[PDB]
Design a protein around this ligand. Structure first.
Ligand SMILES: *[C@@H]1O[C@H](CO)[C@@H](O[C@@H]2O[C@H](CO)[C@@H](O)[C@H](O)[C@H]2NC(C)=O)[C@H](O)[C@H]1NC(C)=O
Ligand SMILES: *[C@@H]1O[C@H](CO)[C@@H](O[C@@H]2O[C@H](CO)[C@@H](O)[C@H](O)[C@H]2NC(C)=O)[C@H](O)[C@H]1NC(C)=O
Ligand SMILES: [Cu+2]
Ligand SMILES: [Cu+2]
Ligand SMILES: [Cu+2]
Ligand SMILES: [Cu+2]
Ligand SMILES: [F-]
Length: 497
């Protein structure tokens, strides 16, 4: 029941009750989470998105981002509203037609208009590798081995009141889970394994906000992939996974046939597992159909620490092995005050004309691009370093860069940089007060690429900038289809802009 790489995808409103509480939602493919979109490395994806939304309480416009896919030469297909496109209006469709050269791993897709993905438009996106270097480490890798972690809210995203704290009402694992308050014994998700087999579990955070402490009672987890990047095997017994991150891990079904709790503890909302909140079930074939009776340890023996991860391939780190050892070394001032986030003193407010369209129309430096102060040019064929010092309220903030992955030269909670063999990824926690999480990449992908906190409430409140990478080559690199050119006139007509 995976779809793609060539598929329609209808976006609709419907009622759902994933924790026993009914509310309307914004859904892809009629389900929460949406169906898995899948193909093989190098494939041409043609995802024709039909906007069938009618309920304005969750916005009737939409736009979909394919998280972690580089979109080289297809910046127009990336999805962030008012960065690479105007939204698709109701009753219309749009073909996101792109290729995935050189990428294979675990990704996801989500609305990228306002806070709409929180209302339900989120699902997995898997790019398989027929020649996966990790293939011999497991036996089973299919739709039954994808594990999604989601926050779920009873209040609609657009209806979250100004000036009140936002927390979720349930953790959903594979779309099911129990509410933190007024808990009812609604069904839990079951992940089934066969004793003796090995599984590539593809763990996807589709969170709008919380990070999760993920574990499986009785089991450990051997990480083999981080945000699309193959890793050396790293065995852990708990994974702290931030919004939008992905891991693959090998699960060896090497415990007695039985039932084991799967745990996903968010950093906000309900604490613990009373009544089966924050929980799913790992069930071995042949086990009794009953809840697990296992318990977590008080202290985990081998939690994931990001500096322990290393690429499988020899990826290195571009630039020179010291702070500022890049062609374009940046340090962003990330702040929060009075309900708004800012980067270098500017709070992001989406522009009327998408940044890509401004560039195609001839705006050719970043000072000419709107929003003023929110678009930073990057030079072509250059090593970029971005330091992201933490401290802004609401952390730890998982920062994400479109169009690229990056070397994590410095991770949370550790002052020592790594210029030799750090993991590469696309979404990174910037940590806690006094940290200096730092990323590096090379600019070989012309176009405007969003950089933002992936806590969607923080993005909405301005925690973003756009990197206009290689403005001079953006138009030649990214030819646009007529349907894309038609989006802004249709949107602006519909909205009387
Ligand atoms: C994080 O690292 C960056 C460099 O990657 C530091 O930036 C330097 O900041 C000082 C002022 O604080 C400037 O004088 C330098 O020109 C900056 N660049 C360098 C040294 O390469 C930044 O201070 C660090 N931030 C924290 C909070 O540790
Ligand atoms: C803090 O981060 C540093 C840098 O990533 C880690 O240092 C590396 O540690 C490994 C394992 O002992 C060594 O092989 C490397 O040579 C170290 N690199 C550097 C640049 O020092 C360090 O382990 C991390 N600290 C903790 C507590 O995990
Ligand atoms: Cu994303
Ligand atoms: Cu993205
Ligand atoms: Cu944030
Ligand atoms: Cu984004
Ligand atoms: F991305």
């Amino acid at each position: 029941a995976q779809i793609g790489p060539v598929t329609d995808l209808h976006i609709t409103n419907a009622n759902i009750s994933p924790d026993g509480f009914s509310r309307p939602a914004v859904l892809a493919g009629g389900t929460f989470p949406g169906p898995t979109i899948a193909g093989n490395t190098g494939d041409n994806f043609q995802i024709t998105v039909f906007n069938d939304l009618t309920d304005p309480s969750m916005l009737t416009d939409t736009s979909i981002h394919w998280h972690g896919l580089f979109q080289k030469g297809t910046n127009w297909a990336d999805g962030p509203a008012f960065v690479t496109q105007c939204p698709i209006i109701t009753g219309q469709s749009f073909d996101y037609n792109f290729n995935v050269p050189g990428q294979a791993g675990t990704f996801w897709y989500h609305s990228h208009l306002s806070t709409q993905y929180c209302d339900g438009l989120r699902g997995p996106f898997v790019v398989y590798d027929p020649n996966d270097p990790n293939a011999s480490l497991y036996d089973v890798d299919d739709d039954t081995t994808i594990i999604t972690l989601a926050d779920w809210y009873h209040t609609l995203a657009q209806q979250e009141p100004i000036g009140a704290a936002i927390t979720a009402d349930a953790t959903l694992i594979n779309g099911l889970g129990r509410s933190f308050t007024n808990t009812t014994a609604s069904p839990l998700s079951v992940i089934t394994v066969q004793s003796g087999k090995r599984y590539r579990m593809r763990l996807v955070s589709i969170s709008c906000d919380p990070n999760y402490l993920f574990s499986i009672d009785g089991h450990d987890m051997t990480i083999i992939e981080v945000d699309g990047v193959n890793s050396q095997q790293l065995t852990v017994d708990q994974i702290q996974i931030f919004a939008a991150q992905r891991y693959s891990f090998v699960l060896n079904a090497n415990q007695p046939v039985g039932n084991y709790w799967i745990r996903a503890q968010p950093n906000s909302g309900g604490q613990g597992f009373d009544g089966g909140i924050n929980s799913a079930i790992l069930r071995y074939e042949g086990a009794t159909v009953e809840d697990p009776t296992t318990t977590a340890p008080t202290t985990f023996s081998n939690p994931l620490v990001e500096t322990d991860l290393h690429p499988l391939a020899d990826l290195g780190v571009p630039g020179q092995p010291f702070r500022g050892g890049a062609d374009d070394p940046l340090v962003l001032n990330l702040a929060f005050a009075n309900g708004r986030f800012s980067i270098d003193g500017v709070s992001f407010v989406p522009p009327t004309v998408p940044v890509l369209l401004q560039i195609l129309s001839g705006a050719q430096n970043a000072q000419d691009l709107l929003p003023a102060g929110s678009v930073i040019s990057l030079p072509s064929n250059s090593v970029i370093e971005v330091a992201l010092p933490a401290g802004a309220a609401g952390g730890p903030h998982p920062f994400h860069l479109h169009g690229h992955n990056f070397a994590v030269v410095q991770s949370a909670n550790n002052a020592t940089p790594n210029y030799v063999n750090p993991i590469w990824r696309d979404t990174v926690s910037i940590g806690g007060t006094g940290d200096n999480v730092t990323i590096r990449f090379t600019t070989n992908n012309p176009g405007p690429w969003f950089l933002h906190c992936h806590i969607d409430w923080h993005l909405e409140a301005g925690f973003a900038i756009v990197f206009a990478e290689d403005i001079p080559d953006t138009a030649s690199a990214n030819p646009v289809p007529q349907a894309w050119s038609d989006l802004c006139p249709a949107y602006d007509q519909a909205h009387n802009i």
